[PDB]
Design a protein around this nucleic acid. Sequence first.
RNA 1: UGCU
Lengths: 731, 125, 50, 422, 120, 54, 149, 248, 99
Amino acid sequence: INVEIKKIMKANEKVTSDADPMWYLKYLNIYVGLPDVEESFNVTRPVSPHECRLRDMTYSAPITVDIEYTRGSQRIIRNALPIGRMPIMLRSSNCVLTGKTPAEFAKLNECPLDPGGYFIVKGVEKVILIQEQLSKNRIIVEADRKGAVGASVTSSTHEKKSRTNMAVKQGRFYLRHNTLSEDIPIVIIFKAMGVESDQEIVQMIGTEEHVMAAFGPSLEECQKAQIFTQMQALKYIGNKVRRQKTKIEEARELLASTILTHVPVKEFNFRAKCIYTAVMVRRVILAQGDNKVDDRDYYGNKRLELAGQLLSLLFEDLFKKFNSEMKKIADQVIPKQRAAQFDVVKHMRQDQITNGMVNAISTGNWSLKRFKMDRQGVTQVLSRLSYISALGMMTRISSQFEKTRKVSGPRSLQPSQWGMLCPSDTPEGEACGLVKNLALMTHITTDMEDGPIVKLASNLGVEDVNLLCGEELSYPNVFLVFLNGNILGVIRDHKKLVNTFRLMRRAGYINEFVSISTNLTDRCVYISSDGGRLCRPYIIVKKQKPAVTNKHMEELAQGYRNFEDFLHESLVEYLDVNEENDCNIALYEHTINKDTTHLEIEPFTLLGVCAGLIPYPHHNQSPRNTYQCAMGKQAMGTIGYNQRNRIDTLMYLLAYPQKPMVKTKTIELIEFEKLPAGQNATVAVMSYSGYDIEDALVLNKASLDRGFGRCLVYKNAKCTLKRYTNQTFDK
Amino acid sequence: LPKDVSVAELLRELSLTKEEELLFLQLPDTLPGQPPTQDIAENACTLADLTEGQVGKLLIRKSGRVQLLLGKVTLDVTMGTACSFLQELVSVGLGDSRTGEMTVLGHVKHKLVCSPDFESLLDHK
Amino acid sequence: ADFDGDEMNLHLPQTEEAKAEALVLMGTKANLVTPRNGEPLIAAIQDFLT
Amino acid sequence: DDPVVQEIDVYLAKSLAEKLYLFQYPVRPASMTYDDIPHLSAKIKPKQQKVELEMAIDTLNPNYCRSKGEQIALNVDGACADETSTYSSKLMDKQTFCSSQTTSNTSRYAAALYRQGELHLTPLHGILQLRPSFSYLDKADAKHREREAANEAGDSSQDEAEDDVKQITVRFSRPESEQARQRRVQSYEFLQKKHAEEPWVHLHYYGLRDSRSEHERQYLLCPGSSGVENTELVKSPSEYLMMLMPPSQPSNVLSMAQLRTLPLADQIKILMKNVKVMPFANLMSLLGPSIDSVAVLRGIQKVAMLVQGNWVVKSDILYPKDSSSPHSGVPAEVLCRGRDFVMWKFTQSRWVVRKEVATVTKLCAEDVKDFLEHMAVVRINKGWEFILPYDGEFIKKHPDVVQRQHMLWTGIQAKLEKVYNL
Amino acid sequence: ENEQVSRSQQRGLRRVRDLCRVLQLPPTFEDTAVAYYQQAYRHSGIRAARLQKKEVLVGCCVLITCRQHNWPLTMGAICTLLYADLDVFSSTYMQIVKLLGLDVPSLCLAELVKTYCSSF
Amino acid sequence: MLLFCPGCGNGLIVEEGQRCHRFACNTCPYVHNITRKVTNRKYPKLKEVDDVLG
Amino acid sequence: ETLEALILKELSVIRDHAGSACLRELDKSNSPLTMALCGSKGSFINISQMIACVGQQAISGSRVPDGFENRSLPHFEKHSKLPAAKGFVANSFYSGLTPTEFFFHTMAGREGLVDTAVKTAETGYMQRRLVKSLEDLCSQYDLTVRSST
Amino acid sequence: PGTQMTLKTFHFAGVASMNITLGVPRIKEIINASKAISTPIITAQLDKDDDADYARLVKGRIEKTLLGEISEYIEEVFLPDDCFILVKLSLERIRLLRLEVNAETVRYSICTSKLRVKPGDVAVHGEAVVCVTPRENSKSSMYYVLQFLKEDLPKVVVQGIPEVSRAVIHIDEQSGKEKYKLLVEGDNLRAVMATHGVKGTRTTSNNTYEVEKTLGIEAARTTIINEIQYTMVNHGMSIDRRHVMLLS
Amino acid sequence: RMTVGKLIELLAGKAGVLDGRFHYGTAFGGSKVKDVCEDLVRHGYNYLGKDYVTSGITGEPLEAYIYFGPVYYQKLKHMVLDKMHARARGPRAVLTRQP
RNA sequence: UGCU
Ligand SMILES: *[C@@]1(O)[C@@H](COP(=O)(O)OP(=O)(O)OP(=O)(O)O)O[C@@H](n2cnc3c(=O)[nH]c(N)nc32)[C@@H]1O
Ligand SMILES: [Mg+2]
Ligand SMILES: [Zn+2]
């Protein structure tokens, strides 16, 4: 709501119609304002989230904008005009709950301990779960359906997303794209992309004897045909192009823009794309031998899209639709209406964006036609069974699979989930392994500018890929460097590069969230700066001694410094999955050896919120912990200090709730002791009367009479008395 | 062919033999200097702004360290990508607007890369 | 079953012939063994064996 | 590791700064060179550098197929047309090498000529990769197309005069939309036409074996003394770092660096609001030794009070006039009065009773607990004790400050006795 | 229904809905406005009328729907957003109210006061 | 092995001329007559003696 | 694979010896021991796991695979095939499990859970097909099993 | 029992290799009676079950052996007179593996479903030398087909059944005597029984379709019953044989 | 089920309610068994939780000691009053006349 | 969405 909405407005700032030139509609600045209610007669009034829940309305703010247009060639400007209503998230920057003391929360009828972060539409509380998908712009080498080891790459830019594959079904590399009638050999594409010398193609592919032996069939198949020039290759591609020299132009356009959109071309210069496809073919050849097949379940190649990105995409789509509708209305009204000059203000729909947002948040189905994205189950009703239930549901993660196949791969617990997601917290049932919860200590990165990163990489001696041929890619000491899937260049002695980059990041000249990883099997150094990556703080260890000391901890306890000071003083740093793949971490101080780079802050942070309630979980079994989390997601207890004024369709409360005697540090952090969901009872483990055969228990009549286990069930019955079209009303 | 190092390369080029050699070095984008009366701004300072004469020194310390003292700062020089294809250095001088002269100065065999010593630049202040 | 929240169904026949067939064929005393291998399934359980 | 030997000097040359190009052959190994291959001409352009070399190859050598040469010559050219022929004779004699541009800017690249005890650096005006181009095949394809057209026209022995008068098919110069105009501008044909619009320049080739090569090779050197102190290149490491990395543009939100970048008064105010208990020596150590002690004393005397040698932040600094109690909602004035009473009790006696403070101030248990925890700790069988010990060093060093704080505390005690009726 | 409707009546209905959505009136107000517009269109005198006549008919139907629920809305802003002049607006309003005879609740003073005070 | 034309760089195929077998290019008149024996061994991995199981 | 098998054999021998030692040192009247002897619930394997030492965490009949590059977790060295680095659990449930051992145990538990989840649907479909195919046969009075036709 | 089975692993039947699908997937494959099954197993007995030499001999006879797996080097030599491919057979490895394959057998194996190579193209010069000289077929093929030959020649079968992929020697160490048997991961029981030295009277196979096509419907029924019983016993659960008999 | 953690939690809770403290069950740490055993032996209770208990039905002591202690039990929303169902003839569906 |  602060930066992305402004960027979208700037991208779609100007809209104009083809007919009647010199007419335009220019957007200057968009505002969201404070949450207001349209109940009063054309009057705004501050409304509280509790009031919205009671009245079954939406907690949104009026979206306003200042615009300038030309009615009759005379420029007329508007300083404030509403265009829609954006549902405001609770405890946000513009929310009324933020910056409030518990006294003000009580005055506004809201619980101070409420996690917030959820939307209120039509009285129901909806939460946008975190979506987990595969990283874009990355080569994936894997077996095909029949078992053919091939490669795939899904190039996704801000406009289009195209997946192109490469197969070795008949010993030669055939490239497959959705815009081609039939898969064509890779050598023809090489010849079409400028590089026509077979010697240069082979040097780019590789100089190894096995590489040449494997690539020989492709050269033979290419030489069988009469394709030897760029013109002939482009003609062949155009002949193979599906309907949407003209064929040559279409083939060149597809090769430049459609195929491998993430690889940019300066001015029809396919050198970078040629190097990219050569590296892809080299990786395929290397994988065709030793079965070093990459796995999809490796979370180092996963991205988490928070509600912000989804809302940004939805707002962009809705704004584009509104601009198209306004342009159509202008084209239909201006030329044949009357001498009365037409202006947009008379047709500026103020309910389109509001209804779109309300439907997308309530129904949960998102259908973006501009991106061809049809998702379901994005929003879910916030479970108010207990405070623990709400806090655990707020930090859930849904997967892109959404119960397509019982693969058991993504459902299994991968070692990459260390410190990021709770291993034991998972719903028991059909959704086991697909719905996960974040760990107690973790973070999700955002998008950076990538400017200083490129500048530092260029200054650190990274040689331009266009300066040298592809033969240098086959050397053992020459390591490729990639930047968000794009080939940044080559480098030698990557140890110095990685050390200098890490030192600069610790100093602060580079954003601490930019991850750097090195894979020696492929000799590739990846520099990740996109958002959605999972990171975890770690204490830096140098020469068998951590940087953090007792003096620093005492200063933190007294208040001299904070976590930001620790980050700035090169004491604690954020590590990504790909970075910890290469870095060494120590669990405790006694485990620190000579080959250690980082130290674990706390081991108990591995568990999630729901698992943090388990007392001594390392003494129990994993299914026991899973069932305990599942039942704690339904445990009965108090919800908040406003549970009496809160009116829900179903609520369960406890008469005499008591905080646990054996409470965990996680419990103290989440303040669950203030809102417990159970009672401590003098339990005796024994067999009595044979009424506790299989997992059953025997209760005491006197204990139940004296108030033990007393529960209250609150149900809501709602009725509406609406007025119909005719002047009549229900009474 | 074992991978050579810059110190040994210079040693065998100067002591073992005396024949001149053409080298190609990649300097950083911005040099530690200011464009002398070039109408500015903290912009990039390349060799096109510097004048002739002594601009820096090449030092070779023990353990194989090769440094370049270009003023108050000291860069480090390392061996670049070992190019094996033909590289011919030529000067194309367009003395006349209608006819020019292409002069082959020599051949390029080795490549060097100069990088700032960011560790020293950080530990200095 | 394990007595940990299982919901089981109970049906009442509406015909004397159906009632007799259920009592005879589906009798608990007559179905003490499984047809798979003849092993008895209705026997002692935890808290009884001990 | 000291520079024992090899103290080579570096010189700079600007004679061939704009006339030095780097041509490299990705398909020709360094072993075989073009020194023995006779060149003919080279086509180049000043802007948008793209050089095309035209060389000559031998024919009498055993590594040439004369029959295939005749075949390719007859395919690319006509029988005896010879008006626009890619080869003078009926054999493939000329070879075409086309240049591809690596990067737009080559200022960071320089050629280093090494001599005995000195290294001369010369900037490069351009770097191009030379590869064997295939344009004779395209010309042969065009020739085949026109031959097929001629055959289709001459399908009959005698072709009658065709009445194919060109009707006036003058299409509209329709006003192209902005999107379509941008597409046309970005099309490859438009860029190729723009590149072709620039005229070519023909240049002769002078091999390395020629005397002109050694004559011009000396221009890479510069006349100058061995030791000359450069006027430029004298910036400090911090300035160089700032040049090579230019910038982009609870109450503890500000970090240590963001705190230090603020004035001394704001620094002291934020430190007091965060910690609320700190000795003067600790404050000096945190602020830095470069700041004057009198300045720090002046800064702290306005936002803190002296309690048993230690400094405690004032109540109004923690509780602004528009704030309120987060637990009870009482106004900030009552909280300030209670905190002042607590501080006065601590100054009078090191041991303070929570029950007595609550009974006197008429405040709630949570507020009293917060006030006591902000500046004290719990001791068994003794009540609440000040978190820091008695600092007599500062009291002995600054007696006038002690007297000022004593009179201020006397005034505060008078106000408290007037308000609470002690 | 929705098939024995002319393009002019459809354009009038769409204009009614567009103005209702611009003014951010509830769907009940939209339904009442379209119902009143259809009821007025039933008459032939309004059916075969001027373009400005039907535009003012849209405006007056919106005004009647707004008045029927005790909602304040100034005829000045209605004319401003309707592309019409006050003289013809009032003339056609009088003609249509005389032809129909629908209830015309008086504009409450307090509601208009509150609406105008929220403007400042 | 895989051989390339020094002139253009395209792949070379083995053909028979008027005097002896020679390597030749499909895009230029360049040829190369064979003087002595030329071999390209691959040393395929032999099948090891699968020992008894158990 | 030979090294993997030898390490697994050594870990199994250690587990069996620890279980035997625990069973020999435990005195009679012990509730878990009595329950395991009578067979009502539990067994010597579970007793040894919860008292003496937990067994090797086997995933798909093998040690914990290398999730990261050449190692299961970053806390261990690269190309390290040690028991504690590949899944061995030295400590028992009484003494408490280390973070890596607990993570491996959770991996095994989730693998078992997903296996059972797939098995439920697979066997349901198989049983439906089998019954729909075999629901026509019946035993006649002449001791001959005949179909519906 | 489908629910009772947990789909365990590591059940190599005592060989610590040759992963075979057992459990619910195996029961599904059996009840479906697919023509091609996953990991078929053929168990064959030996007339001389105590001689490891004869066991290896019959293993080599039944197992498919490619040319590249026995030849030590294959070189495409272009002599100034002609171009041809020379294959050198490793007689040492041949006699170590006890394979009855010589230059004549290799020559006979060549010219079989290989672009119709005439017998005159292949020749033998030494004891373990094979010279192949192809000719242009005029069907979009020229003398430069030596590359295709190099690609597809090493994968030519010289001895063994093409359907057989891997045959191993299993040993039973009964205290009375240690006997040997053949375990074949192929889909051809008829060839395995027809091979010399294999006691075809006691040969069993896992592929129900092959058993039916080879030994009859009754043999298929018996094989189905035995396989279902073995798969059920592997999980420790027992079923009355009457159920599987009725199913078969 | 190998739920030794439940026994440890019970022992820690008993020690805490005896000594007026709150023990911590932090994962991979927390209060050890030795500390709670020392607390129990100091307060006069058995160091293993098992205490001498007399049967309430027969009034005679039990041959084996019973393991008493405070455990944090939490009630779930699953209620038999809500899960109980009994369907008479009742209504049917319009399309297919079934319940 | 939860439950076995
Ligand atoms: C849940 O997140 C989604 C997922 O439901 P689906 O299984 O995708 O719905 P379906 O594919 O259409 O299943 P079916 O074909 O059997 O009808 O949907 C919500 N949800 C689905 N089903 C239920 C349900 O039965 N009860 C509740 N309370 N929610 C359901 C969930 O949000
Ligand atoms: Mg159950
Ligand atoms: Zn060639």
